[PDB]
Amino acid sequence: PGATLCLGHHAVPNGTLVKTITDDQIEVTNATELVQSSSTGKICNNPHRILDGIDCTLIDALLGDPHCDVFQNETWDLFVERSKAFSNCYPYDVPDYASLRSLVAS
Amino acid sequence: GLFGAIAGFIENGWEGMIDGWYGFRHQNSEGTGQAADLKSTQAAIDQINGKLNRVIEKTNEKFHQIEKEFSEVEGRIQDLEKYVEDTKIDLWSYNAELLVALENQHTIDLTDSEMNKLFEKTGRQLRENAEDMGNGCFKIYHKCDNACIESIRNGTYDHDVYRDEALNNRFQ
Amino acid sequence: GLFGAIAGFIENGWEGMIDGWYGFRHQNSEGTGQAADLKSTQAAIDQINGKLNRVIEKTNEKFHQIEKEFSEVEGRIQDLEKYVEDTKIDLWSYNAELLVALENQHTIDLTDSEMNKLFEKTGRQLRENAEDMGNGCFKIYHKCDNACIESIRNGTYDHDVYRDEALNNRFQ
Amino acid sequence: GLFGAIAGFIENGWEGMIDGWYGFRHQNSEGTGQAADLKSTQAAIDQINGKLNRVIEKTNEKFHQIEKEFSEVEGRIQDLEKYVEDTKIDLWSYNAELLVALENQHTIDLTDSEMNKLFEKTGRQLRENAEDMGNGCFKIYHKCDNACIESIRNGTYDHDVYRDEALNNRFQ
Amino acid sequence: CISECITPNGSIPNDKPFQNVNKITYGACPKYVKQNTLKLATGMRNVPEK
Numbered sequence: 001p002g003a004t005l006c007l008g009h010h011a012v013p014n015g016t017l018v019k020t021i022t023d024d025q026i027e028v029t030n031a032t033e034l035v036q037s038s039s040t041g042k043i044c045n046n047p048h049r050i051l052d053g054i055d056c057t058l059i060d061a062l063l064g065d066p067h068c069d070v071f072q073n074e075t076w077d078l079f080v081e082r083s084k085a086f087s088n089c090y091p092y093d094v095p096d097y098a099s100l101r102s103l104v105a106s
Numbered sequence: 107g108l109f110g111a112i113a114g115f116i117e118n119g120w121e122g123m124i125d126g127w128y129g130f131r132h133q134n135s136e137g138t139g140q141a142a143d144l145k146s147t148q149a150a151i152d153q154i155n156g157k158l159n160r161v162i163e164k165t166n167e168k169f170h171q172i173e174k175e176f177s178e179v180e181g182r183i184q185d186l187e188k189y190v191e192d193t194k195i196d197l198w199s200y201n202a203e204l205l206v207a208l209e210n211q212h213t214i215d216l217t218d219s220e221m222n223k224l225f226e227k228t229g230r231q232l233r234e235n236a237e238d239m240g241n242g243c244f245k246i247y248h249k250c251d252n253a254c255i256e257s258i259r260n261g262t263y264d265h266d267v268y269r270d271e272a273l274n275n276r277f278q
Numbered sequence: 279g280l281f282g283a284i285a286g287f288i289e290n291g292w293e294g295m296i297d298g299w300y301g302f303r304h305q306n307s308e309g310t311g312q313a314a315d316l317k318s319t320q321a322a323i324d325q326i327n328g329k330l331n332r333v334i335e336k337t338n339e340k341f342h343q344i345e346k347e348f349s350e351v352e353g354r355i356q357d358l359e360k361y362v363e364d365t366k367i368d369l370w371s372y373n374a375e376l377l378v379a380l381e382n383q384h385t386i387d388l389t390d391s392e393m394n395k396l397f398e399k400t401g402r403q404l405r406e407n408a409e410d411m412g413n414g415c416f417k418i419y420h421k422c423d424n425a426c427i428e429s430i431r432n433g434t435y436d437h438d439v440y441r442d443e444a445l446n447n448r449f450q
Numbered sequence: 451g452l453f454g455a456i457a458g459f460i461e462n463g464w465e466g467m468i469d470g471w472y473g474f475r476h477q478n479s480e481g482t483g484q485a486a487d488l489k490s491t492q493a494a495i496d497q498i499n500g501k502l503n504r505v506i507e508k509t510n511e512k513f514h515q516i517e518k519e520f521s522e523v524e525g526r527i528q529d530l531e532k533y534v535e536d537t538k539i540d541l542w543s544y545n546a547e548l549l550v551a552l553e554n555q556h557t558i559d560l561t562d563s564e565m566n567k568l569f570e571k572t573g574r575q576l577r578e579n580a581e582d583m584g585n586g587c588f589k590i591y592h593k594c595d596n597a598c599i600e601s602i603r604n605g606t607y608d609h610d611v612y613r614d615e616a617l618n619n620r621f622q
Numbered sequence: 623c624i625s626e627c628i629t630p631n632g633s634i635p636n637d638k639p640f641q642n643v644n645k646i647t648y649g650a651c652p653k654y655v656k657q658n659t660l661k662l663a664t665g666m667r668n669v670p671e672k
């Protein structure tokens with residue numbers, strides 16, 4: 001005349017595989033993803049001030065290419081350059097173009 | 107795991123324990139039953155939530171950085187920019203791999219540990235009134251009704267009340 | 279901690295143990311007393327000094343490096359220098375944070391372990407002459423004067439001498 | 451180690467145990483003997499091979515990089531290339547030192563753990579028919595011939611067969 | 623819409639510590655890594671059978 005008392009823990013029909021020091025794959029009851037691997041495909045306009053360059057590079061806007069003069073006195077947290085931008089003024093180059101673009105963007 | 111309870115002397119988990127991570131199953135004169143252990147469950151849960159919140163805390167904020175894609179071949183300066191970025195990425199990738207490996211090994215061991223601690227605590231309450239059957243179960247050597255089982259589960263079991271009966275059954 | 283002794287079955291520490299990290303308190307026919315355990319204390323201290331010396335070993339020596347502050351805007355090359363430095367600092371800050379987190383988890387666990395090892399060793403000396411009360415104390419079932427307590431503390435306790443007396447007290 | 455078995459309650463290893471990592475030595479009415487425990491040996495070996503395979507996996511493949519030695523003094527750009535390389539090497543060297551330290555601490559701890567798990571499992575098989583002598587050996591309180599010893603080693607020992615004899619020897 | 627982290631592919635959530643979307647980012651962003659998935663266990667070993 002007595003009783004039995006067993007200790008145990010839960011389980012589920014199928015858990016998730018994770019990596020450890022000793023195992024490339026071992027099953028636990030639950031896990032959570034630490035790598036963000038997807039995007040909606042759209043840039044959110046808040047909280048950062050986004051300035052869409054549209055047909056203009058930042059340098060064309062700086063110099064004041066007429067079709068870019070819409071951008072006069074503009075400000076941004078992030079300036080977004082589009083692959084469709086084009087120059088439409090006197091043909092020019094900027095020695096160290098990359099540096100001028102950087103320091104203005106900043 | 108290091109403690110040998112989970113996937114150890116506990117032969118398997120219970121898919122039917124759906125209200126807790128750890129718990130008890132019993133058989134006595136009034137039938138059989140099951141109950142989650144809230145304290146051990148919450149101890150494991152609290153530790154896991156602790157490490158999760160440490161890991162997902164505070165992404166860094168960066169603004170103007172260096173260019174990472176290039177439309178013209180440039181040689182030396184571009185080579186250096188690309189090498190700096192590749193180097194950075196390989197180091198962070200290593201940190202990420204190692205971080206999850208260490209955390210996960212430790213998570214398995216801490217849950218194994220919590221299981222083992224609950225087992226040891228129960229054994230200690232039972233004193234000389236029960237024996238470890240070696241599969242994570244105790245044989246209790248006295249009549250132990252539902253209220254008695256509950257006294258064990260809630261940590262108020264009084265071994266002296268049952269000691270004469272139990273010793274008589276164990277040793278004679 | 280993983281072993282469930284410190285902040286576990288040992289309900290709390292002793293502010294009154296001022297000559298050691300781990301030890302014994304007793305009550306017998308000659309009164310009560312307390313004594314540090316030197317070996318367990320020293321084992322913990324030795325491990326902690328070991329990891330401390332590994333961490334504070336060998337700062338790196340660096341001489342001519344790159345500039346890290348600039349008085350003029352320069353563009354591309356300065357962006358790259360500053361990016362290299364920020365990347366470096368962020369990686370090391372990550373290393374420092376992770377290093378202390380892992381060390382501290384392990385320090386808590388190793389001290390917890392030493393506590394547990396001392397308890398298990400004492401239990402093993404006592405054989406059938408004592409029972410674990412579940413709070414880190416043993417009930418010893420025979421007269422055990424000051425010299426007897428010290429024989430347990432110094433690891434020479436001879437269980438056979440007391441076994442008949444103890445079993446008579448435990449079981450009859 | 452954390453568990454206190456290896457270099458612990460097991461006083462030393464056996465140079466004479468050559469066919470397993472863990473095992474048994476016995477003395478009974480038919481003589482003495484030794485046998486490796488295959489399951490515990492293989493569990494440790496499997497864990498160590500697991501971590502070894504994680505560590506030696508996948509070197510990175512890199513092709514065109516930056517120059518790392520220079521035949522002319524150049525100033526700023528060279529300063530930066532050399533600093534980038536020096537910084538990278540210092541970070542990887544840190545990763546390597548830390549990696550082996552953590553793995554090795556854990557290897558010592560997991561092997562210690564396996565020793566402890568085998569000991570506890572054996573104890574659990576023996577139930578009330580044996581007592582832990584405190585040095586990793588069990589005193590078995592009944593006649594236990596070579597087939598009996600083997601029944602303990604292969605995990606089929608039936609404690610009930612011997613319980614009456616053992617209890618008579620232990621307690622009376 | 624609202625997001626702290628911007629990549630050339632579009633905005634991404636910054637609740638996770640790492641990301642595999644783009645090495646180019648602006649704002650409070652997960653760190654870019656090569657792996658496309660890394661799982662952090664949030665539960666014990668799952669042992670439904672012996």
Ligand SMILES: *[C@@H]1O[C@H](CO)[C@@H](O[C@@H]2O[C@H](CO)[C@@H](O)[C@H](O)[C@H]2NC(C)=O)[C@H](O)[C@H]1NC(C)=O
Pocket residue numbers: 037038039175630631642643644
């Ligand atoms: C985000 O955009 C990047 C850059 O365009 C994508 O990376 C490219 O992916 C394609 C297809 O896998 C590859 O052929 C290119 O080599 C990648 N470019 C670079 C520079 O790495 C990426 O796939 C996009 N990510 C998401 C989630 O949309």
Ligand SMILES: *[C@@H]1O[C@H](CO)[C@@H](O)[C@H](O)[C@H]1NC(C)=O
Pocket residue numbers: 252253254256257260262
């Ligand atoms: C523990 O269980 C007993 C028996 O069911 C009950 O009388 C008592 O109220 C419980 N104690 C606590 C602390 O809940």
Ligand SMILES: *[C@@H]1O[C@H](CO)[C@@H](O)[C@H](O)[C@H]1NC(C)=O
Pocket residue numbers: 424425426428429432433434
């Ligand atoms: C241990 O304690 C006993 C009892 O007082 C004493 O006789 C003996 O000398 C001690 N042994 C050691 C190793 O110090």
Ligand SMILES: *[C@@H]1O[C@H](CO)[C@@H](O)[C@H](O)[C@H]1NC(C)=O
Pocket residue numbers: 596597598600601604605606
């Ligand atoms: C275990 O040992 C016993 C005794 O020698 C033997 O009868 C039995 O076949 C063995 N069982 C297994 C599983 O090998």
